[PDB]
Structure formats: structure tokens, C-alpha cells
Amino acid sequence: KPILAPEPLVMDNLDSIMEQLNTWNFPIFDLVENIGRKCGRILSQVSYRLFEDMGLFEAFKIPIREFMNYFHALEIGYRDIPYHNRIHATDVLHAVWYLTTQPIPGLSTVIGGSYVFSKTYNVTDDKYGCLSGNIPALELMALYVAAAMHDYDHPGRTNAFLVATSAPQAVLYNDRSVLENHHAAAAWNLFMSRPEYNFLINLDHVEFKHFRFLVIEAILATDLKKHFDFVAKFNGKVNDDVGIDWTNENDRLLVCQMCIKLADINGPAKCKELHLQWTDGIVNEFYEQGDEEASLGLPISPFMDRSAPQLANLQESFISHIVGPLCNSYDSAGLMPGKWVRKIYCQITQHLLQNHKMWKKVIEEE
């Protein structure tokens, strides 16, 4: 039986929270409370609003019922686990939308046809552009769909755990990007399983194949084992003879991959209150894994032992080794949203710096 979207497709009572999607520190946990914690509708409701904000329904003649059917089925297959749940998917989708639609100081834009723009884009100053002016709508839509799908049916275990235990999924994917291959494959399988889910019906065959390829490339880019390769490749392309060439499809793909990568690990670049809640989630998953490791007679992985937590060290090293260099690379390309204030004020990097200082201070006291 198909999982179909519930009640009236669009919920009416969420208007005041949804108007604040144009903010970086979107109060996603307030939205969760407003909807109901295990209601299973947050992803489809946010997705509807963002697609409508971008005019993507008109751009691709997307039937809304099938769109909501699919995004509801998708959200239902995110498990009720502390971090890799439908709330995290929604968060990543919101982050890729922000990064691609919000004003970027001194970015040059194609328009200001095959491009779409957010209704929240109000600056008419030529000293501001946005990524959606440089990346065609089809490719942007793939990125958004990828974000919604990117952790589908996550089991609450890391790739290394699946591999070390010879989990059926690790055997199936030959130890290579096990979770990410699964997310993409299971979400695509879900999509093709029912005509009630076919919201892409008005793409031609060529468009559809290219869309599918972009979605897969974006989802597979979320494997952190490939992190340093993506960052080196991006830094290489930024510092060459011409820089990012927006007319080159491979350059655009690489930009989209950096975008979804940053969106996926956005937590440490949010306000303290959001960052801390998300952090609680991730470590609760780690601890569940640690318990399973112990019961299997394996050594408990670093930072996964609930009876010897090293929260501050985890967050500090994650920021210094992963998020920090990724933000620096993205910022050096001049792709970070921000405001002119001759100088630029960038909220995202400011938050990251503040959160890094906070964890450092905790480490000093310990």
C-alpha cells in the first residue's frame, strides 16, 4: 500500500513559524513542537514551502499531490532515532536553500529563464548575488531533493561500525560509502515504487537522467571519508587561472557538493542554543552504538563511551579538522552569505568562531 500525504496537504496553523525560514537560525525545534514530535510531517511541510518560495512547482509543472505523497513517504522512512531523523533532513534542506538563495556580497549573477529566485530575495543592490542566479533550476532542485533524501533510513550507526561488524549493508555495498549508497538507493527505490510518488513526471527522459545523476552525486558527497578530497579539489579550482567557471557543469556540480556538505554539518555554525541541541542528538546516537560495540565485544569507538564522555573534545576537534576548513574554503571562494557593513559581516563564520571558542574554554576548565 502507498503511504499518502495526510489531512489537507498543506497545514494551515504553521504560518508564523514558516515565515522565519528566511533566517539562518530557523527555530526548527519550535516547529517540531508546533506540529507534534512524532507526527511525521515536518519534512514535507517545509519542502512544500521552500519549493513554493522558489516557484519550482511552476518551473517543472510538478503536481503537488504526488510531491507531498513522496515527501511524506520519505519522512516516514526516517527512523525515530536521536539525530539521523526527519528533523535533521529538514534542517539540511533548509540550510542548502539558505546557502543557495540568500544574498552573497560581491557575487556576480546571471539574471538578478532556466533559473529561479526566492521570494525572500529583496536586495536590488548590484553588490549582492545568490547561487540560484548561477546554478540552473534543475540542478538546484536536485540539490534540494538530495538534502531531503540524504540520510533516508539511517540505522543510527556509522559506516565503520557497519563495516567492522560485516553488517548485511556493508557486504552489499562492498564496504564503500555504505550508508550514503543506501540512503540514495532506498530513497530512489521508494520514488520509483509507486506512480502516486512521481512528481518529476514532466521532466523529459534526458532531464530525468541528469537529475537522478545530480541527486546521487550530492548524496554520495556527504560521506566524510571523501571530505579532504572534495575540499582539496575545491581549493584547487578556486586558486587556478580562471577560478569557478559558472558555465562549466563540473564546476557547478562541485559547488553544489560543497553546499550540501556544509548544510549537512551546519550545526556548529548555528547559534549556541541550536548547536547544543543537535550535539546532544549526535552523541546520544554515538552512545547507543558504543553500547552495541561493548555487547559485541568490540572496543568502544572514540567519543562513544557514555561512561567516559569527551563531548567538548569531540566538538572542538570536529570544528578544527572538518567544519573549520570547509567553511574557510567556501568563504575563500566568496560563496558565504553575508552583509556589507567596505567590510563584510558573515553570521555563519561568526557563529562557528564563537562555538569554537566556547568548546575551547570548556576544555581549559576540565
Ligand X SMILES: Nc1ncnc2c1ncn2[C@@H]1O[C@H](COP(=O)(O)O)[C@@H](O)[C@H]1O
Residues found near a copy of itself in the complex (CB under 8 A): 166, 171-176, 181, 184-185, 188-189, 192, 212-213, 216, 220
The span of 26-34, 97-105, 134-142, 258-266 binding Mn ion (CB under 5 A) equals 258-266
The span of 129-137, 143-151, 242-250, 280-288 binding Mg ion (CB under 5 A) equals 143-151
Q: Which three cell numbers stand for residue 41?
A: 510531517
Of residues 139 and 151, the one with the C-beta less far from Mg ion = 151
State the minimum distance, in angstroms, from the CB of residue 226 to ligand X: 11
SS (H, E, C) the chain: CCCCCCCCCCCCCCHHHHHHHHCCCCCHHHHHHHHCCCCCCHHHHHHHHHHHHHCHHHHCCCCHHHHHHHHHHHHHCCCCCCCCCHHHHHHHHHHHHHHHHCCEECCCCCCCCCCCCCCCCCCCCCCEECHHHCCCHHHHHHHHHHHHHCCCCCCCCCHHHHHHCCCHHHHHCCCCCHHHHHHHHHHHHHHHHCHHHCCCCCCCHHHHHHHHHHHHHHHHCCCHHHHHHHHHHHHHHHCCCCCCCCCCHHHHHHHHHHHHHHHHCCHHHCCHHHHHHHHHHHHHHHHHHHHHHHHCCCCCCCCCCCCCCCHHHHHHHHHHHHHHHHHHHHHHCCCCCCEECCCEECHHHHHHHHHHHHHHHHHHHC
State the minimum distance, in angstroms, from the CB of residue 32 to ligand X: 17
The span of 101-109, 117-125, 150-158, 352-360 binding Mn ion (CB under 5 A) equals 150-158
Of residues 239 and 332, the one with the C-beta less far from Ca ion = 239
Report whether 126 belongs to an annotated binding site. Answer: no
CA distances from 183 to 39, 177, 349 (A): 22, 10, 29
Q: Which of 53, 91, 217, 264 binds Mn ion (CB under 5 A)?
A: 264
Report whether 169 belongs to an annotated binding site. Answer: no
Q: Which three cell numbers stand for residue 279?
A: 550535539
State the minimum distance, in angstroms, from the CB of residue 305 to a copy of itself: 21
State the minimum distance, in angstroms, from the CB of residue 92 to Mg ion: 9
Work out what residue 265 binds among Ca ion, ligand X, a copy of itself, none; the CB cut-off runs from 5 to 8 Å by kind: ligand X
84 is catalytic: yes
Of residues 253 and 333, the one with the C-beta less far from a copy of itself = 253
Q: For residues 135 and 257, is the Cβ–Cβ distance under 8 A?
A: no
Of residues 47 and 177, the one with the C-beta less far from ligand X = 177
How does strand 344-345 pair with strand 339-340? antiparallel
Work out what residue 267 binds among Ca ion, Mn ion, ligand X, none; the CB cut-off runs from 5 to 8 Å by kind: ligand X
State the minimum distance, in angstroms, from the CB of residue 168 to a copy of itself: 8
d(CA 326, CA 281): 22
One-letter amino acid for residue 21 of the chain: L
Work out what residue 151 binds among a copy of itself, Ca ion, Mg ion, none; the CB cut-off runs from 5 to 8 Å by kind: Mg ion
Is 151 a binding residue for Mg ion by CB under 5 A? The answer is: yes
Q: Which three cell numbers stand for residue 168?
A: 548485511
> Which residues in 230-249 contact Ca ion (CB under 5 A)?
239
Options 72, 84, 275, 351, the catalytic residue: 84
Binding site for ligand X (CB under 6 A): 84, 150-151, 158, 222, 224, 264-265, 267-268, 279, 282, 314-315, 318
Of residues 134 and 257, the one with the C-beta less far from a copy of itself = 257
State the minimum distance, in angstroms, from the CB of residue 176 to a copy of itself: 8
Work out what residue 282 binds among Mg ion, ligand X, a copy of itself, none; the CB cut-off runs from 5 to 8 Å by kind: ligand X
Report whether 151 belongs to an annotated binding site. Answer: yes
Q: Which three cell numbers stand for residue 147?
A: 538534502
Summarize the annotated binding site as residue ranges: 84, 88, 150-151, 264, 315
Catalytic residues: 84
Binding-site residue ranges for Mg(2+): 151
Q: Catalog residues that contact Ca ion under the rule CB under 5 A.
A: 239
Binding residues for Mg ion, rule: CB under 5 A, are 151, 222
